[PDB]
RNA sequence: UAGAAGCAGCCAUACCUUUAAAGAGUGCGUAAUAGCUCACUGGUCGAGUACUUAAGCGCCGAUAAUGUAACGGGGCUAAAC
């Protein structure tokens, strides 16, 4: 997995998570990226298996960048419980993305090759994705 | 999109003219059905007699021959036909075309020797002619 | 040399919710700033930018006119949002035309090395090269053909075939942009 | 047979047509038929 | 919309042809057929040929103007040269007989099947295991055909059935093939 | 066949498995070009330099090293 | 590899050639081939076709139990937007 190796503290607030994307928001590394078209939470597994499906599709071709980090606990009360004593317990790691992040970045393959790759990717994300080849680079 | 087959267009028709101008005679093979072991071998009794056999588009030859003053009948240029220029046996040409048209289904649609469009019996009688 | 050429015409909103209504009535807000001028707010017509510029580089150059005057000009900057592939606002600066200038520029590989079919190894050791000429004539990209390098082979500064009035700027000419080892 | 909500061809033989409302696969290979739930 | 709804309609000398009130009749040597013609079509017989046209461009139009086209053009050729669509009945003991204006299909099942044949269609038998439906209209060639054929569709282990001429059936295997 | 031809001549009697990299060894210019005039009857071309680059478009196939 | 002939699988197709045009073969089926087809190209006919992007309405997805029961109802193709 991805995850942090140490925290200042535990557990922290759920914040409001609003507005696009202002930062980390344009093509880096890489030739072709794989922005999202919501305000939500990628998990850090759920960010291991979309790199799992394009990088078995790609065969050696390339390289793939990952623009996101999770570092964000997210608590859950043991099962049978009430409301009572407080912020029970990290669970797994959840990483913020807004309406236009990067979230993905790949080198190497062919365009056709990496629309494929990025949409078998885009297949286990919880949001909805475009891909987009530099659009000032071919 | 389109400047490109503008260009390979124009690139077949000067290599077509490049060949017509090269040509004294010229003639039109309908080859439907003639096998690729058969136009191998009609190639190369054409290349063994100094003639240059090929594959023309029909528009393309049509446009080229109106340029260059050849008015032929455009059903020599109807169906798939290639055309073989031959500049200094016209008989041996017309031979070896009834002798595949004998070996096989290969029709000697259209000729021009001499800016003469041949019709069929005038190049049937050009074939059988024996050289000088 | 049309197709270097961009039509304008002058704007006084300035604000948001005027740009805002200016990128409905589809086109983009810009300035134009240098040569010590005051700075010319405008706006130009995002059909004609995209057909024409849909690829800009840092090194592209261009041609403003507004009907009265032309301007060569850099696109310095260009606010783009990815997602709904839209621009939302042009920075130019202004170089005078006639003044010889300086400006790194990518090069552009092409070809198969027939070193590196035969077990080469590509190490591109610069992405870019300085080279001089008056704007209007300065180089998007610089191409560079790899397959006669065979193996155990650089490529010199100097053997980059340039455009007509583009010319190299480097201190070291004998640095080799990619070998082939 | 393959009565599903994503309903793409599998071969480039297969065909889309849309049937009295409903959008369908028709192929040869009969094993590659389809229609939308 | 596309080249077959404007391909003009050629007329046989011995077919005759006339439109009215949204309606066709096409008489010839063998029949005369009708047709329904919608009013957002018009047919018109000019030069001993048929053409059809739009008066609107919606796509229900669009799609009648080859409809028509079509519907006029097998009208035509029915009343020439009529449709004949052809039958093959494969398999151990199935057989077919004709007496009158019926058939007789004996296809395995412990009933021998009576089969009467609509009005307007003849059929032709070659020896016992051949058919050919022959008529004016070819909706209803195919539809007697097809009728026939449900009778006992074919089945892939064998090729046994009523099977269109035309048909290619795709073939499977059973035990042998299997053999490792 | 030209294959085995080239590995009588290079001695070669099992095709190298990776032809594109791991080399079974080396096809002489002069050593090609006697076996292509010799080859050239089964060849269809009509000049001894296209057959040449026949046979060594064989070779490289087969992963022979092509001769400088 | 026991058999790979284009189609268990591996390396690439930096194999040229007569080159119409023909990929170190697209699919089916063959123990392996054969065989039947495709990409490509020539004729016939005759201008839009072939793949994407933006905006407005749509379709499937759409699925619980006393009775149509998710416009108030009748009804409405506008009496909708
Ligand atoms: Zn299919």
Redesign the interface.
Same mark, same amino acid.
């Given at each position: 997995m991805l995850s942090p190796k140490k925290v200042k503290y535990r557990k922290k607030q759920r914040g409001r998570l609003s507005g696009?994307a202002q930062k980390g928001?344009?093509?880096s590394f890489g030739e072709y !990226?794989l /922005?999202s078209?919501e305000t939500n939470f990628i998990t850090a597994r759920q960010i291991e298996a979309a790199r799992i499906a394009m990088t078995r599709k790609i065969k050696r071709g390339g390289r793939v960048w990952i623009r996101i980090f999770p570092d964000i606990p997210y608590t859950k009360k043991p099962a049978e419980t009430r409301m009572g004593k407080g912020k029970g317990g990290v669970d797994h790691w959840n990483a913020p993305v807004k309406? !236009?992040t /990067?979230m993905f970045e790949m080198s190497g393959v062919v365009e056709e090759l990496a629309q494929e790759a990025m949409s078998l990717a885009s297949s286990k994300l919880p949001v909805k994705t475009?891909f /987009?080849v530099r659009?000032?680079?071919? | 999109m389109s400047a490109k087959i503008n260009a390979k267009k124009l690139e077949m028709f000067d290599l077509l003219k490049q060949f017509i101008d090269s040509k004294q005679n010229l003639f039109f093979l309908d080859y439907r059905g003639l096998n690729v072991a058969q136009l191998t071998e009609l190639r190369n009794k054409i290349e063994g007699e100094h003639g240059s056999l090929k594959v023309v588009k029909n528009n393309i030859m049509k446009m080229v021959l109106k340029e260059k003053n050849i008015n032929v009948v455009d059903s020599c240029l109807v169906g798939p036909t290639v055309v073989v220029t031959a500049l200094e046996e016209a008989n041996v040409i017309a031979k070896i075309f009834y002798d595949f048209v004998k070996s096989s289904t290969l029709k000697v649609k259209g000729g021009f020797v001499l800016g003469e469009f041949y019709d069929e019996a005038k190049v049937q009688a050009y074939s059988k002619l024996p050289t000088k | 040399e049309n197709s270097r050429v961009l039509s304008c015409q002058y704007r006084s909103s300035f604000g948001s919710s005027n740009a805002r209504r200016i990128r409905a009535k589809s086109e983009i807000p810009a300035v134009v700033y240098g040569q010590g001028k005051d700075v010319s707010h405008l706006r130009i017509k995002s059909s004609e930018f995209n057909k024409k510029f +849909? &690829?800009?580089?840092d090194n592209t150059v261009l041609i403003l006119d507004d009907g009265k005057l032309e301007r060569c000009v850099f696109v310095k900057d260009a606010a783009?949002?990815? +997602?709904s &592939?839209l621009i939302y606002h042009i920075d130019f600066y202004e170089v005078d035309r006639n003044v010889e200038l300086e400006k790194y520029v990518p090069i552009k590989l092409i070809g198969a090395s027939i070193g590196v079919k035969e077990?080469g190894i590509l190490t591109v050791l610069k992405e870019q090269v300085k080279v001089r000429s008056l704007p209007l004539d300065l180089p998007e990209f610089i191409e560079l053909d790899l397959t006669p390098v065979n193996k155990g082979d650089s490529v010199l500064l100097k053997d980059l075939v340039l455009p007509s009035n583009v010319r190299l700027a480097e201190n070291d000419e004998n640095l080799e942009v990619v070998i082939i080892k | 047979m393959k009565v599903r909500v994503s309903v793409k061809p599998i071969c480039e033989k297969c065909k889309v047509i849309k049937r009295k409302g409903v959008l369908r696969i028709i192929c040869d290979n009969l094993k590659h038929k389809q229609r939308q739930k | 919309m596309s080249r077959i709804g404007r391909l003009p309609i050629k007329i046989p000398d011995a077919v005759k042809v006339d439109v009215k009130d949204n309606l066709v009749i096409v008489e010839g040597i063998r029949g005369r057929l009708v047709q329904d013609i919608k009013d957002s079509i018009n047919v018109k017989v000019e030069n001993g040929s048929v053409i059809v046209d739009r008066v609107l461009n919606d796509k229900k139009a669009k799609a009648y103007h080859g409809l028509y086209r079509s519907l006029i053009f097998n009208m035509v050729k029915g009343v020439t040269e009529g449709f004949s669509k052809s039958l093959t009945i494969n398999g151990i003991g199935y057989r077919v007989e004709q007496q009158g204006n019926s058939l007789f299909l004996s296809l395995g099942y412990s009933t021998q099947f009576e089969y009467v044949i609509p009005d307007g269609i003849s059929v032709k038998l070659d020896g016992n295991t051949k058919i050919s439906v022959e008529g004016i209209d070819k909706f209803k060639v195919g539809q007697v055909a097809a009728e026939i054929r449900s009778l006992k569709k074919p089945e892939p282990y064998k090729g046994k059935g009523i099977k269109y001429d035309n048909e290619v059936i795709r073939r499977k295997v059973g035990k042998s093939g299997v053999k490792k | 066949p030209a294959s085995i031809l080239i590995k009588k001549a290079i001695g070669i009697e099992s095709g190298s498995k990776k032809s594109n990299?791991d080399k079974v060894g080396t096809i002489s210019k002069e050593k090609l070009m006697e076996i292509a005039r010799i080859k050239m009857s089964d060849l269809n071309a009509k000049s001894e330099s296209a057959a040449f680059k026949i046979i060594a478009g064989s070779a490289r196939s087969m992963g022979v090293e092509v001769e400088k």
């Open positions: 696009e928001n344009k093509i !990226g /922005v078209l309406l !236009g /990067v475009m /987009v659009r000032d680079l071919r | - | +849909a &690829k800009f580089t783009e949002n990815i +997602a &592939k077990g | - | - | 990299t």
